[PDB]
Amino acid sequence: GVEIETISPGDGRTFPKKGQTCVVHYTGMLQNGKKFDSSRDRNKPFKFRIGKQEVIKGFEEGAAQMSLGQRAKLTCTPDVAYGATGHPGVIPPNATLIFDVELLNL
């Protein structure tokens, strides 16, 4: 259950495919309002490949459904997230995650 709202036009027709790299500048916040991660604070694009279960399923599905030059906010349910086995000292168990996702290339 991922809800995507198009906050950017994203006229690019390119779509991610299997076995491809994908760069996203992601910013995540907990639904109360505090953030835990921001790749842009590191000034480095987050390179991840579609598949291989490198990232949670919600983030990968959201990145797959949205395209180049597009921005969107992903509503990640705890079922598709860490859930009960939350991140140690970072994310409390049974919490939702909101991501500021955007491709730059591929």
Numbering used by the authors: 1 to 106
What does the paper say about this structure?
With the expected functionality of the R615C mutation confirmed, we solved cryo-EM structures of wild-type and R615C pRyR1, under nominally Ca2+-free conditions (5 mM EGTA), in the presence of FKBP12.6, which was used as a bait protein for purification. In both cases, one major 3D class was obtained, along with a smaller class with poor quality that was not further considered. Importantly, for WT pRyR1, we can observe unambiguous density for the Arg615 sidechain. The location of this residue seems critical: Arg615 is situated in a junction between three solenoid domains: the N-terminal solenoid (Nsol, residues 395–630) containing Arg615, the junctional solenoid (JSol, residues 1657–2145), and the bridging solenoid (Bsol, residues 2146–3613). Nearby residues that form potential interactions with Arg615 are Asn1678 in Jsol and Glu2175 in Bsol. For wild-type pRyR1, the major class still represents closed channels, but for R615C pRyR1 the combination of cryo-EM condition and mutation results in mostly open channels. One of these two conformations, corresponding to a closed pRyR1, is already observed for WT pRyR1 in the absence of apoCaM. The narrowest point in WT pRyR1, found at Ile4935, is now wide enough to support permeation. Not surprisingly, the structures align very well, with the differences only found in regions that are generally more flexible.
Ryanodine receptors (RyR) are >2-MDa membrane proteins that allow for the release of Ca2+ from the ER and SR, thus mediating a range of Ca2+-dependent processes. Each forms homotetrameric assemblies of ~5000 residue long subunits. Mutations in RyR1, the skeletal muscle isoform, can cause malignant hyperthermia (MH), central core disease (CCD), and other myopathies. Here, a collection of cryoEM structures provides insights into the molecular consequences of MHrelated RyR mutation R615C, and how apoCaM opens RyR1.
